[PDB]
Amino acid sequence: KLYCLSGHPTLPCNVLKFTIMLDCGLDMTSTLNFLPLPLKECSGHVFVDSVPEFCLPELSTVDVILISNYHCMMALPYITEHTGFTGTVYATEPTVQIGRLLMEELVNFIERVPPLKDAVEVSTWRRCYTMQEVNSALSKIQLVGYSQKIVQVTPLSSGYALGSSNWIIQSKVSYVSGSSLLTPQPMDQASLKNSDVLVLTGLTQIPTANPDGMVGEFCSNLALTVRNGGNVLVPCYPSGVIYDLLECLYQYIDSAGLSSVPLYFISPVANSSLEFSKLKHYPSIHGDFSNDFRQPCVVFTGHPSLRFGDVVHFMELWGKSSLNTVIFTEPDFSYLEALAPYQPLAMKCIYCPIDTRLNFIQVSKLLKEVQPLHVVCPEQYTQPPPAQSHRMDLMIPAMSYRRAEVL
Amino acid sequence: CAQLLPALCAVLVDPRQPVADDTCLEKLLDWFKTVTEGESSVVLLQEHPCLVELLSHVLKVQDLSSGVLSFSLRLAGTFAAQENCFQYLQQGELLPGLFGEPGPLGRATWAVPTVRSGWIQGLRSLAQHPSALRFLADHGAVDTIFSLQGDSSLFVASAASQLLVHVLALSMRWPACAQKIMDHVEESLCSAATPKVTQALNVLTTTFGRCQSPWTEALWVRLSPRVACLLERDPIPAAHSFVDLLLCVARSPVFSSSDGSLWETVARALSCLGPTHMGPLALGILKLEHCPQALRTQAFQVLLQPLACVLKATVQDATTVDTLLASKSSCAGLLCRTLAHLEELQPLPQRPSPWPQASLLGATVTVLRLCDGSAAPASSVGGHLCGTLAGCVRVQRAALDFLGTLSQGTGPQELVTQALAVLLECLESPGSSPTVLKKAFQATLRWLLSSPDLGPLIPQFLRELFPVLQKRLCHPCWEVRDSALEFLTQLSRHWGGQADFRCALLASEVPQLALQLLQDPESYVRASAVTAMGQLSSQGLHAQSLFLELLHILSVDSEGFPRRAVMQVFTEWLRDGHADAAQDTEQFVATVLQAASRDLDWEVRAQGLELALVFLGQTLALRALCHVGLFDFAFCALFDCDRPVAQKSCDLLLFLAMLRSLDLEGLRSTLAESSDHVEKSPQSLLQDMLATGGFEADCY
Amino acid sequence: EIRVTPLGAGQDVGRSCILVSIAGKNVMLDCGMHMGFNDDRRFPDFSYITRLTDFLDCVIISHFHLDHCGALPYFSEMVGYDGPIYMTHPTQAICPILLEDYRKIAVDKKGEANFFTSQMIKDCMKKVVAVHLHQTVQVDDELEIKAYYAGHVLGAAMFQIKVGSESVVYTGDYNMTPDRHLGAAWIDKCRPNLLITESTYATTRCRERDFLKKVHETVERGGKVLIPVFALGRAQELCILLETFWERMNLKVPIYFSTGLTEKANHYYKLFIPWTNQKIRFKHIKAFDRAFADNPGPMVVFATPGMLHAGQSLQIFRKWAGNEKNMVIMPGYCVQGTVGHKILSGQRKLEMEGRQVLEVKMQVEYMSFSAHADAKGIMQLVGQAEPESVLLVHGEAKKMEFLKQKIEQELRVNCYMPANGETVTL
Ligand SMILES: [Zn+2]
Ligand SMILES: [Zn+2]
């Protein structure tokens, strides 16, 4: 069995009955239906005027959670502590620390100021967790290392980011989420070969885009506007695509000679996040930041849903002049739905999604090298994408929201 | 040289010496080939009898190195290129023994490819007269070339084949050599081995493209059934040598006036050869007007149809469909060769009269859109071309080159719009490679100058091109900023005076990004931005103190290409008469020639002397020449470290009291030959070979 | 199968253009050159592979030496190749300053007949996809390349070429001596089918001490020193010796330097620090001017044309002479046509234009500062890689015979040492 949940492909709560859970991810795509946090009309879009509620996946017996990432973690206290759950969580410490950073900054984002017909489920959207639930959930985590056995459930090193691992379970059922052949420690795909059931929830959300081409397309029109006298706003996380952005932004400063521009970074957990890697960290917008504002700066704010964080200030401030620019590097949130409560924007909106995860070519290569008995995937990774006429679904069942398939 | 020549002849065969340099020996061979043209070789061999002693030691001493063996064989061949020297080199049985068993052919040193490739060259040097033909015929010296036709070295095999061709084409000027050669050729064209068939075709290709005469007609008649029988073999043997033979036979019409079965050998070959080789033969047939139009139509319909499985499967035989869908390798190869052959056939007058310009542009645009997305599939063939050919760099390069060379064909403006609307999409595509961006910039440039005022609908392409040009000038790779600056230079050289290129360029932020590149880390991006902002400021589109930045780059920069580019920019600023370098003609040349004089570079000083040439051509006053150059930098430059810089000064001074004492013409005659002339001379080479002072080859 | 043809250098140093055919992919494994020759023999023979764009998947340039990259702007833009050329990041930057100096030697050696221009150098550099070390680059769906650390000069890499499970790694010009500069070669257990080594030092600190002793002796008795070097070759290795020893025993006597195509050693050292320190996995030296050598007293000058090719070096060497206190140090081969071969061959009477025999009474010394793997290091690299067959494409055949005998004796592997044009089949 595989009692699937949370029909988003990259953020799965796949409750693999056996009773294990394969990941505890949170969609958060609900928050794009709400007004910002500095029903109403905004450029023809209706918006709920409340706290931005979260798409909880649709738990007293699922004794195990195999959390794998830190973008894929942020549903943890919803089902760990406040829901009547007694059990455990496993990950590795580079995952857990910078996951805790994101959850703490999200509580900071929301409790500092305390498509609707097409919405998949509205009766399950609940309010945000609180710091006590965050700490109680993160107190249940039992750290395990790479390739170390915990049924025989073993994590394996993957190539997505720091501590991003993907797990296997022996009797055989394997699993993939957040993997990358281009890179962090490279994939441990050797042990993935002998398998009976396989899961491929973690793949690219923009398969027709080379990630290196998108890094170049980020740096190019960053430098195009910071050489134009205008700022740059990069809505991103303290941990995630920002480290790959910065290890190439330093190289672009070295290579193209773009200097004398101050790279900033504003997040309540960013000072605790940079040690995991000119970048002038400041902790917030109100304080010492207001006195150290050099005009052609490049601020890396805290949340890319464009309602939380300091980013809402920067869109309400910069969003009227064309010199300023926003570059969307996140493959999770919509370029256009997250920009919806600001849509009369003169500010240059740019979508440059850096996703280092598996494009379908190397998905097929990995499946050829592995040769599984069966392969389970999201229903969007079994049929071609709804935006393309290509052949970019893996050839080798499928799952949807609250779909319980049997193998 | 002639005084040292007995000493070196003693040194070369001396076993007590170390091994002579294989470059020294080949330079001696070049010297001997030079000297045995204006003098009779038997006179030379009579006056210096140490050479026959060297050759007799080669016959006699069994332990020479391979280099000196090859040197002596090629030397014997060089001397015995005349008949009298051939009989003089047989008074002691040297030549029959050198190339026969007594020489290196009958011992272990024959294993060295150097000795075999020297034996072939010695024979080719001597086989030039009837006595050499008799010596080749009687002693079996053609059987050895028959064996060496299939040698392991590609340098020996491709020399044995041309030695056979030369022996054949000189014997026919049916003699025993010319008949035994073609007997072996006919036996090999009927062989079951690909190497032997390849060798026979490589002999026939050369001997049919080299000489046109009745005996070649008889050869073609007696061998065209054997040639035509190769097309019934599975697989086809030596397809490219076969195609070369067909296109060298058919390019001479004297073989089609023979039995007609050449044009029926080609006609079946265009229908039975594999998908790799129908293209070259079809292009070669269409490149010549001698083939029948019935054959030519089938020759062109096998060239187009790879670009017709795309047009019939996208815009909403199996002999190409099975090729275009087998793999990315097969599809990529077929389309690259197809667009390359259409690049070759595009600018010819031999092209077919209904040249499908609109359909070819449609197919090219479709291939480009298949590579960079948004190519809708009209079938399942289109659905395999959309995923097989997506993100293919090599087909994108071939298609962009072809779409560049479709510019020359005149057509309606719809073709120009359709081409540019995908060239722009290739420019602004985030995934476009740097090489694809170079191809796309060159293709866009070719397609823009072919729009005859710069034309309607082109300014609206400029306002959509420049927001891509600015983003390309900030590219992470220096290749793409370099390519964008080259594009801006080559577009501001053509329409720099056009209204909608000065109204629409400064309305962008290209000049203020072409100025920020003067401080780019890469010397190439500083150099191509200096030439960019000379061409940008030659037409008045600067967007003042550019001269001081340029003079700063000429003075204190830490690279060479920026200073070369800066002196070039002043060179065309003074040729053109730019206002910065024409408001005060004397003072500018004065302040730039101190920067030019003290350089550690030679092309910068050469450009300074070119600038002095420009100033002296502007003047014709002599007091203006009394500044830091035009009489002083030239005098120092005559004794410069570099011959091109020195020659630039001597040519400048040829064009005052101190000018009288300088022997200009003798200085030029010295400064017209090599800097190596005192060491590429015969005497210096002999001394370098005789140097026993001493002190191994390594990396430079 | 794998078919390898050394197109220009299989049993000689120079014109390195080794060619490898694996399952469906042809790769060119250098584009070498040859000084000496001045007409179309300086370059490899590109008539034994015909179009090249459709036939050749990859071109791979090992390091920046002119005998491994000399024909690259000729092969690309005269012969007509439009494809990917794979140089490590340091090599891509040093190469257009090394090859803009051969264009100067050839421009005054009157050998610009079938030759690459400066614009052609830039165009060839714009076709380069500069890889990083230990990074797997995909050129096709199934063929990948991977650069390594060779440790010979600034940018030397040992490129591995792999389709599926079959592979070949070209270790062009590596080193196995960790010295006071670029370290030793590292290759992991790739275990390929073929290992295409280099065998220059086949039968193979003393030079480090002797160089400084020999300059130290003739700057304290009033003599002068000339080191003839190329632009960014081995001069930058000697600059740190002349700063480190001159921290110890200064004497504060001048040291000059002159290229014109670069800075003294800083663009070299922007690249040297991350390449040497991360990627394995000055006030004494000053500037030189054309009139700055007539100053009396001791002096040390590095000159722009290496090997005593006719240029700055020839003038300075011609002008120190007549003084036995003066001295010149040769660190390179100095090919036959050059004055360097004439003076380190044994001659002291040299001719020039007219009849002007130069009485060379300088001290003349030759300390070969070439960092190649000796006998032991080559077998240690073969032990590191553990291949199925070894190929030898650099060095003289007489020493390569003994290296074949040893590498077939202890390590039970098949060693091939083909001549130019010979095709070996695996
Ligand atoms: Zn070498
Ligand atoms: Zn080397």
DSSP conformation letters of A339-402: TGGG-S--SEEEE-----S--HHHHHHHHHHH--SEEEEEGGGTS--TT--S--S----EE-TT
Residue A97: C-alpha distances to residues A146, B321, B524 (Å)? 16, 55, 45
Q: What is the CA radius of gyration of chain A?
A: 21
- What is the CATH topology of the domain spanning A211-351? Rossmann fold (3.40.50)
Tokens of B166: 């030369």
Tokens of C42: 């300086």
Task: Determine contact, residues A3/A21, Cβ cutoff 8 Å.
Answer: no
Tokens of C6: 């050394």
Q: Is C422 a catalytic residue?
A: no
Q: How far is CA C270 from the centre of its chain?
A: 20
N residues, chain B = 700
Burial class (CB in 10 A: 0-12, 13-18, 19+), A287: exposed
Neighbours of B190 (CB within 10 A): 14
Q: Is the dihedral of CA A77, A79, A85, A89 positive or negative?
A: negative
- Candidates B376, B470, B520; nearest CB to A224: B470
- Within a domain: residue B439? no
Name the region of C155 (left: φ>0; alpha: ψ -120 to 50; beta: rest).
left
Is C289 part of the contact surface with chain B (CB cutoff 8 Å)? yes
Q: Residues C112, C142, C166, C198: which is the catalytic one?
A: C198
* Measured distance CA(A58)–CA(A15) in Å, rounded: 11
Q: Do C336 and B21 touch (CB under 8 A)?
A: yes
Using alpha carbons, select from C159, C197, C161, C206 the residue that is nearest to residue C176.
C197
Specify the DSSP class assigned to residue C140. S
Name the region of B552 (left: φ>0; alpha: ψ -120 to 50; beta: rest).
alpha
Q: Which residues of B touch C104 (CB under 8 A)?
A: 602, 642
Using alpha carbons, select from C221, C161, C219, C171 the residue that is nearest to residue C195.
C171
Q: Which residues of B touch A365 (CB under 8 A)?
A: none
From ligand 1's centre to the CA of B24, what distance in Å? 20
Residue with tokens 């090219």: B364
* Measured distance CA(A218)–CA(A300) in Å, rounded: 13
CB pairs under 8 A between A and B: 67
* Measured distance CA(C376)–CA(C356) in Å, rounded: 48
* Measured distance CA(B452)–CA(B607) in Å, rounded: 37
Phi, psi of A77 (to 5 degrees): -80, -15
CB pairs under 8 A between B and C: 201
* Measured distance CA(C425)–CA(C422) in Å, rounded: 10
* Measured distance CA(B410)–CA(B60) in Å, rounded: 73
Task: Determine contact, residues B466/A224, Cβ cutoff 8 Å.
Answer: no
Using alpha carbons, select from B573, B493, B486, B648 the residue that is nearest to residue C119.
B486
Residue C365 in 3-state DSSP? Answer: strand
Is A114 part of the contact surface with chain B (CB cutoff 8 Å)? no
* Measured distance CA(C61)–CA(B136) in Å, rounded: 45
Q: Do A224 and B430 touch (CB under 8 A)?
A: no
Find chains touching chain A: ≥3 CB pairs under 8 Å.
B
Angle at B404 between CA B403 and CA B406, to 5 degrees: 60
Task: Determine contact, residues A331/A206, Cβ cutoff 8 Å.
Answer: yes
Which residues constitute the domain of residue B633? 544-661
> Across the strands, what pairs with C255?
C285, C300
Q: Which residues of B touch C30 (CB under 8 A)?
A: none
- Within a domain: residue B363? no
Tokens of B645: 């810089």
C110, C294, C402: best to mutate for the B interface, most B CBs within 10 A = C110
Tokens of B616: 């002296």
* Measured distance CA(A19)–CA(A85) in Å, rounded: 13
> Which alpha helices (DSSP H) does B577-663 contain, by range?
585-597, 602-619, 633-638, 643-654, 657-661
* Measured distance CA(A109)–CA(A301) in Å, rounded: 11
Q: Which residues of B touch C261 (CB under 8 A)?
A: 559-560, 601
Contacts of C23 (CB under 8 A, 6+ apart): C142, C163, C164, C166
Q: Do A390 and B387 touch (CB under 8 A)?
A: yes
Burial class (CB in 10 A: 0-12, 13-18, 19+), C400: buried
Neighbours of B488 (CB within 10 A): 27
Using alpha carbons, select from B388, B406, B387 the residue that is nearest to residue B444.
B406
Residue C216, marked binder: no
In CATH terms, C205-366 corresponds, of 3.40.50.10890, 3.30.70.2190, 3.40.640.10, 3.30.70.20, to 3.40.50.10890
Backbone breaks in chain C after residues (C–N over 2.5 Å): 50, 204, 281
- Within a domain: residue B571? yes
A 324-363 residues with CB below 8 A of B? 352
Strand pairing category for C363-366 and C159-163: unpaired
Tokens of B341: 């052959």
> Which alpha helices (DSSP H) does A200-298 contain, by range?
211-226, 241-256
Residue C19 in 3-state DSSP? Answer: strand
Specify the DSSP class assigned to residue C110. T
* Measured distance CA(A273)–CA(A101) in Å, rounded: 7
- Within a domain: residue B403? no
Q: How far is CA C404 from the centre of its chain?
A: 24
Residue with tokens 């047989």: B90
* Measured distance CA(C335)–CA(B609) in Å, rounded: 32
Q: Do A213 and B476 touch (CB under 8 A)?
A: no
Specify the DSSP class assigned to residue A187. P
Residue B563: C-alpha distances to residues A205, A214, B316 (Å)? 48, 35, 55
> Across the strands, what pairs with A136?
none
Q: Which residues of A touch B313 (CB under 8 A)?
A: none
Task: Determine contact, residues B283/B347, Cβ cutoff 8 Å.
Answer: no
Find chains touching chain B: ≥3 CB pairs under 8 Å.
A, C
* Measured distance CA(C107)–CA(A312) in Å, rounded: 63
Backbone breaks in chain A after residues (C–N over 2.5 Å): 18, 38, 58, 114, 150, 171, 183, 277, 396
Phi, psi of B90 (to 5 degrees): -115, 5
Tokens of A259: 């200097």
Contacts of A327 (CB under 8 A, 6+ apart): A218, A221, A222, A232, A233, A234, A350, A352
- Please tell me which residue of chain C has the smallest CA distance to B600: C260
Phi, psi of A321 (to 5 degrees): -110, 140
| Element holding B286 (H helix, E strand) | helix B278-286
Strand pairing category for C424-425 and C3-6: antiparallel
* Measured distance CA(A100)–CA(A80) in Å, rounded: 14
Task: Determine contact, residues C92/C120, Cβ cutoff 8 Å.
Answer: no
N- to C-terminal Cα separation, chain A: 6
Burial class (CB in 10 A: 0-12, 13-18, 19+), B545: exposed
* Measured distance CA(B521)–CA(B478) in Å, rounded: 9
- Please tell me which residue of chain B has the smallest CA distance to C288: B600
> Across the strands, what pairs with C416?
C391
Contacts of A313 (CB under 8 A, 6+ apart): A38, A285
> Across the strands, what pairs with C21?
C3, C26
- Within a domain: residue B558? yes
Q: What is the CA radius of gyration of chain B?
A: 33
| Element holding B332 (H helix, E strand) | helix B328-345
* Measured distance CA(B42)–CA(C94) in Å, rounded: 52
> Which alpha helices (DSSP H) does C109-140 contain, by range?
118-125
Contacts of A309 (CB under 8 A, 6+ apart): A109, A235, A267, A301, A302, A303
* Measured distance CA(A221)–CA(B2) in Å, rounded: 72
3-state secondary structure B376-414: CCCCHHHHHHHHHCCCCHHHHHHHHHHHHHCCCCCCCHH
Is B687 part of the contact surface with chain C (CB cutoff 8 Å)? yes
Residues that place a CB less than 5 A from ion ligand 2: B 699; C 65, 173
Neighbours of A76 (CB within 10 A): 27
Task: Give chain B's contact residues with A (Cβ, < 8 Å).
Answer: 373, 376-377, 383-384, 386-387, 390-391, 430-432, 470-472, 474-478, 481, 509, 512-513, 516, 519-521
Using alpha carbons, select from A329, A278, A336 the residue that is nearest to residue A303.
A329
Tokens of C88: 């490590």
B470, B474, B508: best to mutate for the A interface, most A CBs within 10 A = B474
Tokens of B565: 């580019």
| Element holding B555 (H helix, E strand) | helix B546-556
Task: Determine contact, residues B322/B274, Cβ cutoff 8 Å.
Answer: no
The DSSP-derived string for B180-211 is: HHHHHHHHHHT-S-HHHHHHHHHHHHHHHHH-
Looking at the 3D structure of chain B, how many domains does it have? 1
Task: Determine contact, residues C161/C27, Cβ cutoff 8 Å.
Answer: yes
Name the region of C215 (left: φ>0; alpha: ψ -120 to 50; beta: rest).
alpha
* Measured distance CA(C297)–CA(C288) in Å, rounded: 15
The DSSP-derived string for C198-264 is: --TTTT--HHHHHHHHHHHHSSSSS-EEEEE--SSSSHHHHHHHHHHHHHHS-----B----SSS-S
Give binding residues of A as ranges.
Answer: 1, 18
* Measured distance CA(C245)–CA(C240) in Å, rounded: 8
> Across the strands, what pairs with A173?
A169, A197
Using alpha carbons, select from C214, C227, C296 the residue that is nearest to residue C259.
C227
Burial class (CB in 10 A: 0-12, 13-18, 19+), A311: buried
Name the region of B328 (left: φ>0; alpha: ψ -120 to 50; beta: rest).
alpha
- HSE-CB at A168 with a 13 A cutoff on CA atoms is 23
* Measured distance CA(A355)–CA(A209) in Å, rounded: 8
- Identity of residue C89: H
Specify the DSSP class assigned to residue A186. P
Phi, psi of B107 (to 5 degrees): -140, -175
Burial class (CB in 10 A: 0-12, 13-18, 19+), C92: buried
Q: Which residues of C touch B560 (CB under 8 A)?
A: 97, 100, 259-262
A390, A393, A394, A395: best to mutate for the B interface, most B CBs within 10 A = A390
| Element holding A326 (H helix, E strand) | strand A325-328
Specify the DSSP class assigned to residue A337. T
Q: Do B156 and C289 touch (CB under 8 A)?
A: no
* Measured distance CA(A370)–CA(C60) in Å, rounded: 32
N residues, chain A = 407
Angle at C332 between CA C329 and CA C336, to 5 degrees: 110
Side by side, which strands form the sheet with C56-60?
C85-86, C56-60, C25-28, C18-22, C3-6, C424-425
* Measured distance CA(C282)–CA(C250) in Å, rounded: 14
| Element holding B214 (H helix, E strand) | helix B214-228
Residue with tokens 């809708």: B376
Angle at B389 between CA B388 and CA B392, to 5 degrees: 125
Contacts of C409 (CB under 8 A, 6+ apart): none
Burial class (CB in 10 A: 0-12, 13-18, 19+), C41: middle
* Measured distance CA(B510)–CA(B467) in Å, rounded: 9
Residue B417 in 3-state DSSP? Answer: helix
Q: Nearest 10 degrees: CA dihedral of B163, B166, B170, B176?
A: 50
N- to C-terminal Cα separation, chain C: 6
Buried b (16+ CB within 10 A) or exposed e, A220-252: bbbbbbbbbebbbbbbbbbbbbbbbbbebbeeb
The maximal CA–CA distance of chain C, rounded, in angstroms, is 66
Q: How far is CA C214 from the centre of its chain?
A: 25
Residue with tokens 């393309």: A388
From ligand 2's centre to the CA of C70, what distance in Å? 13
Phi, psi of C187 (to 5 degrees): -130, 135
Contacts of A125 (CB under 8 A, 6+ apart): A30, A53, A54, A55, A56
* Measured distance CA(C394)–CA(C201) in Å, rounded: 9
Task: Determine contact, residues B682/B642, Cβ cutoff 8 Å.
Answer: no
Task: Determine contact, residues C16/C394, Cβ cutoff 8 Å.
Answer: yes
Tokens of A78: 């919803």
